[PDB]
From Swiss-Prot:
Keywords: Ribonucleoprotein, Ribosomal protein, RNA-binding, rRNA-binding. The gene is rpl18a. GO terms for cellular component: ribonucleoprotein complex; ribosome. This is Large ribosomal subunit protein eL20. It comes from Sulfolobus acidocaldarius (strain ATCC 33909 / DSM 639 / JCM 8929 / NBRC 15157 / NCIMB 11770). GO terms for biological process: translation. Part of the 50S ribosomal subunit. Binds 23S rRNA. One of its GO terms (molecular function) is large ribosomal subunit rRNA binding. It comes from the Archaea. Belongs to the eukaryotic ribosomal protein eL20 family. The keyword Nucleus does not apply.
RNA sequence: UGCCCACCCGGUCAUAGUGAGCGGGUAACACCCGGACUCGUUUCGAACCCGGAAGUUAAGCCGCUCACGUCAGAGGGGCCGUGGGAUCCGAGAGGGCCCGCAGCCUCUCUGAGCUGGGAUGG
């Protein structure tokens, strides 16, 4: 099932804060292609951000036994 | 020999400039000694001009160090533009993306006189 952790910069008028409540997200999906499509649609729909302005920098699978947030742990 | 170092005539016209301190000449470049004569000072042989040669490396001149100036290279920082495109965004002011190009200032470090034609010295 490969819980993924996607990190990157999204833009609205020179906006960059690489930490954990205005910059990046967590995703649970089979492969990397599925996880990226989720990030584009969720940020593009909820914040009106086109895909020009979303710059994904790091995507990597994290182990299910160590996640800071318990919301993504509970559906495992 | 030599080559480069001064001198005469230059080119480039601060990377070449300015100030301070120091180094260097038995020749050359100068300061220097003197005025009958050419010439001369609205006074002054100071300057210009003429005639000289005892003295000196103190000036000039050349080189070296250090301060500022100037031209570059590298690095930290402040500011920021633009030619083409879209039934792109926005009430507008303005902004984002695609293809094509950059610039200015300020600090810090490191260097910084090259060169053409002719008679003396090494």
């Amino acid at each position: 099932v490969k819980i993924f952790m996607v990190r990157g910069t999204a833009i609205f008028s020179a906006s960059r804060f690489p930490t954990s409540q205005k910059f990046t997200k967590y995703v649970r999906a089979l492969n990397e292609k599925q996880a990226i499509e989720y990030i584009y649609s969720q940020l593009g729909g909820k914040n009106k951000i086109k895909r020009y302005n979303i710059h994904i920098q790091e995507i990597k699978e994290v182990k299910e036994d160590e996640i800071t947030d318990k919301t993504i742990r509970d559906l495992a």
